[PDB]
Amino acid sequence: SGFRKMAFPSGKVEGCMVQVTCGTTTLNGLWLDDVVYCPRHVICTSEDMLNPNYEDLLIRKSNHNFLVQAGNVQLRVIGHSMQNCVLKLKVDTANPKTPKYKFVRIQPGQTFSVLACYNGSPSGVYQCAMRPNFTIKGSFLNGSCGSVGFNIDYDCVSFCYMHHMELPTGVHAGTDLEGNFYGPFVDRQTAQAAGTDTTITVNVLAWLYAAVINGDRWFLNRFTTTLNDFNLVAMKYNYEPLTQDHVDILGPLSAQTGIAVLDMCASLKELLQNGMNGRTILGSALLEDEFTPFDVVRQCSGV
């Protein structure tokens, strides 16, 4: 029993974190085989930041402009190139701790684990969702750039996020590991705002199932609804639309539970229209939207 915001075990990623310094800029790199990946803004000075020409900034640098430290040892940089917003530094020695891995780009509403790092050294791990507005509500300080987010499947690390910047509102923006930004953001110090965020409906449903699985079921009711009817309510409360795909995804949770997805939508509809106020769910006074259906299955099944 119990339900907590749970991160993947981070051991396989901790072995890949290094420090990357170019001039006076220092941040984290991800060392896999003989390449270190990090944000391309490492090659910026404070003033470059305001309007960088990354082509020209990198044309001016050579391999010896980059210091890469794996804890105590120095990795000799023997090559460099940019892929989109990520710098790739070829080093002279392959990481003996490289895990089975692949680079994957996630959709908004998917969750992942963040290994927050400073000076190449892991300092904490926590669980995040890619918001519908493509930001993530992380916990990052200066020096955290290059920290990565990931999921684990069996024995394969799927890297999905690299940290690049904090927006003025205090939320965070980054890329996949091929350097493609999530969201309409640019790696430049210039005014930019995320769109208005929404609530990840399918994840709220998942968490309500987690509540039922844990014996918390005061919010169930005799009613059902239609996808079409529910989405009228959802749109009005800034909830993401619920799709037939979402219904299917929730299948195994409805099985594991005995509550049909459109039945649970009827409970969520009432929670939106009337609140809960008096009561809590799974120890929360808010409707939690950073657990996916699979998150719930894996935590409640012991995967």
Place this chain on the structure above:
Amino acid sequence: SGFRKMAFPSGKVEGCMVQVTCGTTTLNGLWLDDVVYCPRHVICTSEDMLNPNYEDLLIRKSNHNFLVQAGNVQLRVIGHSMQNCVLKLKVDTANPKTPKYKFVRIQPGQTFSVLACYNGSPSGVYQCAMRPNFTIKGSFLNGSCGSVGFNIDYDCVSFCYMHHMELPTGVHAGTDLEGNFYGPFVDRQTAQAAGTDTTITVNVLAWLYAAVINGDRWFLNRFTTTLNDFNLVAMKYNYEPLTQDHVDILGPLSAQTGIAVLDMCASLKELLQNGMNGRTILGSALLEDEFTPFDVVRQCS
């Protein structure tokens, strides 16, 4: 900026997790140097749970009755002893991944990370606190016994919790790594009510300081309070008493923010009285009590 329930990176502990089986009973062990630590109730059958005599059950076992599996490898048990409610299995190979470590017994209100495991393999990691009633509010299923809680201030792992059992209320009980239970509990399937679960007041204060550090002050007010008057009020909400030790401990956060500890106590008294009125603090609609003063300074600056 931002503020999350952050756990320590679990790699150093993952490399210590093994599976221990005795008869039909299987759980996790912690493999440090040439010893595997696990809950002694691994030697119980379903029929032994109501009134186990562990000394009698253990004397009937030989080393080869304990099957220890590290990944794909079977570790050979060459000896065994019982220390309080933990079993120590000596094995013939020391763990090459053993981190720098120590055992520490923690106090109520302290936080730690949990690496939840099944069959010696990690499921996930999350952050917990030792409740005032000496339970923890974990996320644990059958087979999770032997999972451990830890901190890693610097590069040394401090093991502070081993998971033993789930109470009928759905909260969890276990031991330090010397096998002494936290709280009055016993590794036996008998009734054992946990005390009232009160709120960790000093942690709630640290967390309000976290909110100020991160730029939010809406909940402060113009009042102060005596410590005595604060405690008289707060205990009516089942908040733990705040001691002068807690007040001293909050000194550093008080200094960074410019908010006297008893002025933040006044704000807390008013939050209990008023609730949030539709607002949130650090993304929560409830007052959060599983961040310590030490956690806040670690995460915020």
